[PDB]
Amino acid sequence: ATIVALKYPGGVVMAGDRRSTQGNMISGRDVRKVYITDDYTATGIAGTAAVAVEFARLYAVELEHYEKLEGVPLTFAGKINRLAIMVRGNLLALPLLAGYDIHASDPQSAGRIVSFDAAGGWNIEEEGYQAVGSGSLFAKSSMKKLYSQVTDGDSGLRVAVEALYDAADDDSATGGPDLVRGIFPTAVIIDADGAVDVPESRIAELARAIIESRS
Template identity: 55%
Template sequence: MNHDRAGGPTGILRFATAPGSSSFTEFLAAAAPELMPGKVPDGAVITHGTTIVSLIYADGVVMAGDRRATAGNLIAQRDIEKVFATDDYSLVGIAGAAGMAVEIVRLYIVELEHYEKIEGTQLTLDGKANRLATMIRGNLAEAMQGLAVVPLFAGYDPDATDPAEAAKIYSFDVTGGRYPEQYYHSIGSGSLFARGALKKLWRPGLDRAAAVRVAVESLYDAADDDSATGGPDITRGIYPVVRLATANGTERVGDDELAATVRAILDDRAARPGS
């Protein structure tokens, strides 16, 4: 085959071998635009991810997301994953149109890998946040049609001169606006309730166990008041996705640890009904 169009083998080879941007997103948009996250077919059922929380603790940053995806008033999925490790030191959580959001995150992961291979170094944490903002801005047309994707980005900067300033959290809006956050933040339909819980529970210098508990407890409070946010499901063994980013890299908290944390929260709440 010797196609000479942007999407054909010859066209892709021409773009791949020509000097240009270190952005894989720009390369893909030029070489094979049909592979970019795109419009959803008419009549398709749109599922939405809901609540993501993130907070800074003594060793880095923790991010957690509930597992429910909704389609209108229905539960579309009970065990969706909304929190991803995007490279060795950064995390992204997604809220909004779930299918579109997962596609953007996958493209973003490749974007970071591509940059590192082309430039021989990783982007700074601020640079990673800027790249994500650019990708969200590129989805603005779809957002205006109701396919909004709103991420939460957090990470650890191993090159920070002050370790106390190494962990950072960034929020975004649908236009690609990027906003550094202090201490903690939450996005999604249950974010109002989760942020209220974070405000009461967060304190400086939390250790790992305490930070994981604060994240899970804030999601529990969000699920208590927001029907689109799923609480921990002990019967099915479905717990929030909780990830950490520290100087040692990223880590996913295991379900055994989360099960113990959830049971401790439930025991405390049972002792204080109405809290």
């Protein structure tokens, strides 16, 4: 499994693969690993569907509990602090966080990426892209060369899909586009208007274009 997040002017994009395996045997085919936990925040865990969905549900419940109790949503700094408490208490796969900062001075530079290390410490990415999972190295090396082509949301989505394809090309634990069954990776786009899921047809067309170009 591999989850990739990269920043573009005016927002941030997130995507993940759809494969879960027990060693050398394929366990699932349409595993969803990216979820929307808030109006301006999405999370992703590289692992089984159950762990990721439980983590997303717990984070959403915590955020909504604070929101209902105090009547105001938490600041982005406070959102990261609560997430790290949950990660430390659990310990395991580590989560990836991407969101939008609506209180930032510059709207064009408001997208954020947060990563947690093995020890549970959180770091804020400054290179504009981050990948986690087994194929994280290949995806990051691909984004290193492909990040110069990102200028808007569509370019960022294309680059993320290409990074996922490159990661799946070199890792057997990551699944590539399934053009026989029709199962493509899921993506989430967060901007000033909020976090929205990308429709499967645009994902499908981008994957088909990348596959045709690679031939």
